[PDB]
Amino acid sequence: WMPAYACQRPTPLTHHNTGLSEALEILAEAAGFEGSEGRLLTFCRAASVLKALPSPVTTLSQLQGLPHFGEHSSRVVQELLEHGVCEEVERVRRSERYQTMKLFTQIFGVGVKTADRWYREGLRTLDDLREQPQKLTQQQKAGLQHHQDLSTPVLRSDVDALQQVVEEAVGQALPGATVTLTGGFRRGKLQGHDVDFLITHPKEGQEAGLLPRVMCRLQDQGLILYHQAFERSFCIFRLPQPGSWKAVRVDLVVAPVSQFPFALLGWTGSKLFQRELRRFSRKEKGLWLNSHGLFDPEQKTFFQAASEEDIFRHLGLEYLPPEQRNA
DNA sequence: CGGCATACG
DNA sequence: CGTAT
DNA sequence: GCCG
Ligand SMILES: [Ca+2]
Ligand SMILES: [Mg+2]
Ligand code: NA
User: Where in the cell is it found?
Assistant: First the structure.
């Protein structure tokens, strides 16, 4: 009744096992801080299974036969069901290692490997990093300066205003180019940590060289607080606020229209959904999927797609709208 | 046991 | 190394 | 950590 890959089942944004999935995602996060990508994946997948269930898990026996629930994840759920808390989870939550790796990796420009090295050097706080700024990249300096604003959720109300200003710059850069909202907001989220936009043009090839032209125009409008030929830009934008403004993370991606369905699919996520979809494609169908296309390595051919529906059909999967990709 | 998504800046 | 879903 |  529960298929093993997240791309084989609908996952809504809100569900019936929120507390259970949040606990498993703590353990997944902690596994990632320690470099165990395998354990991170299992805990993420187990969490995702619970999101896809039609009602709350109330008894341990309801986990029988669910994929990705073994001794460890089942014991976590058991303790939560019996006592309302899981000691392992609370131990992680309280730990200096978890709290500091979380704090450091949430800086734009800082990943697990950097955070871990800083942790091993004895650093613990944002002000610890500010006092030693020669150790920081320009990207990290921007992430640290803007860290407080970037920790405030972006609201869907914010997104429409940003999309309008991006469209104006895009339209001057290349008349006829389009901007599509992707990422979590396209899956129905009401808040987010950033805004993701996908840009293309209906005439194949006209999008070449577009992103620099867009970025230069946004920068001339004074809207870019930070940014790095290219096709992806990871920016910090100045977003108007009542009597002021706040910094917001915005990602811009350009794709040729031939690849647009693949880029839309990839950038709409969720992250776990796309990993599971690419895993399914390769392992179950022998096809190689990325945000550019879908390759048959036996015929050495790429699948043409005119829509996301095409891609799901190519892969033998029932279509899922973005709102059901919240794996 | 091997495998765990796949790319660009 | 960072970033993206 | 779990699947096949
Ligand atoms: Ca993003
Ligand atoms: Mg996003
Ligand atoms: Na980071």
Answer: Nucleus
